[PDB]
Design a protein around this ligand. Structure first.
Ligand SMILES: Nc1ncnc2c1ncn2[C@@H]1O[C@H](COP(=O)(O)OP(=O)(O)OP(=O)(O)O)[C@@H](O)[C@H]1O
Length: 318
């Protein structure tokens, strides 16, 4: 029996989509699924962690990535999502650098690094309708993102001509994903990425891959200009259908390989006849889609079998 180890925080490992997917992987004749207990992950040394032949491990808040890396180095399992890349995914500056290296379209942007050791350094000049970052001008509207990919406090600054002020985005609190603020001045402390605001039709596209050749997309209302979350007549968040075009299917292929995360998600902005990526989230499942659960589990089980059946002298064709 090939053992597939699942290593993440309990919030993730016990989520409905995870359980749905692991149920289906368990249907593979030669695969056994072992889910690492969060108490073991946090409290036990990696030498006591359960063995596996294939590891699916991913960082989220509170997760000890150093320990996951140490475990994989100790046991040498087949790794589905590369662990070292998961440090980089936490830093938006590292993300944009990789996308640029891969020739992936993204908004024009500039990084503002604020060193607390150097108070006499200034690389941002603010005007009424623009900012100058490292000498480069961004006219309003522009977007201001914390360099930490885990900090969802993204602000959008409106031009005088539209009423000024700003939209402050945040991790969804129930009925809301953003709020308007009369504040027109940018944040005075911290490091930020500034980028051009891309006009879309009011929706954001979310793409979810299972390896480079499978990508499911769906859209939702953008929190950019209105912060009210749309809900079903039943009560679920409203999603819109998306089919990726050939250029976008290629983007998905590139993002998956560049960041070395088999199961991963990223965002697309459809603007000016093109598609821009400027958020890469790593390990992500689609929720509430039985077809996705079916396909995801099949792809993952097939990947495991293809890689490992030879070692275990298990019959497996193509
Ligand atoms: N350059 C841009 N132009 C237009 N809209 C943007 C731009 N950058 C981000 N947005 C809007 O801001 C929202 C939040 O930005 P982004 O997704 O980068 O932040 P995040 O905090 O990483 O969100 P999450 O990880 O939950 O998907 C996007 O979904 C999109 O609606």
């Amino acid at each position: 029996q090939i053992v597939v180890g699942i290593c993440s925080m309990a919030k993730k490992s016990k989520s409905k989509p995870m359980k749905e997917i692991l149920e289906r992987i368990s249907l593979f004749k030669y695969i056994t699924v072992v889910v690492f207990e969060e108490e073991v992950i946090l409290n036990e040394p990696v030498e006591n962690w359960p063995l596996c032949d294939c590891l699916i491990s991913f960082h989220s808040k509170g997760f000890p990535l150093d320990k996951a890396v140490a475990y994989a180095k100790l046991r040498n399992p087949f790794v589905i999502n590369d662990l070292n890349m998961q440090y980089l995914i936490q830093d938006r500056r590292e993300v944009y650098s990789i996308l640029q290296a891969e020739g992936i379209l993204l908004p024009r942007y500039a990084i503002l690094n604020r060193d607390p050791n150097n108070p006499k350094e200034c690389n941002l000049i603010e005007g009424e309708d623009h900012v100058e970052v490292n000498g480069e001008v961004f006219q309003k509207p522009f977007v201001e993102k914390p360099v930490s990919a885990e900090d969802h406090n993204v602000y959008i600054y409106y031009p005088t001509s539209a009423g000024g002020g700003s939209q402050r985005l945040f991790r969804k609190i129930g009925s809301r994903s953003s709020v308007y603020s009369p504040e027109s001045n940018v944040r005075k402390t911290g490091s930020y990425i500034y980028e051009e605001f891309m006009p879309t039709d009011g929706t954001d596209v979310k793409v979810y891959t299972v390896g480079p050749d499978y990508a499911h997309a769906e859209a939702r209302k953008s929190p950019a200009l209105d912060g009210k979350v749309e809900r079903d007549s039943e009560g679920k968040e409203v999603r819109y259908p998306v089919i990726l075009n050939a250029r976008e299917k290629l983007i998905a292929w590139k993002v998956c390989l560049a960041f070395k995360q088999t199961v991963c998600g990223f965002d697309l902005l459809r603007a000016n006849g093109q598609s821009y990526v400027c958020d890469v989230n790593g390990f992500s499942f689609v929720k509430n889609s039985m077809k996705y659960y079916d396909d995801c589990a099949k792809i993952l089980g097939n990947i495991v079998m293809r890689e490992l059946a030879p070692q275990f002298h298990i019959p497996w064709s193509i």
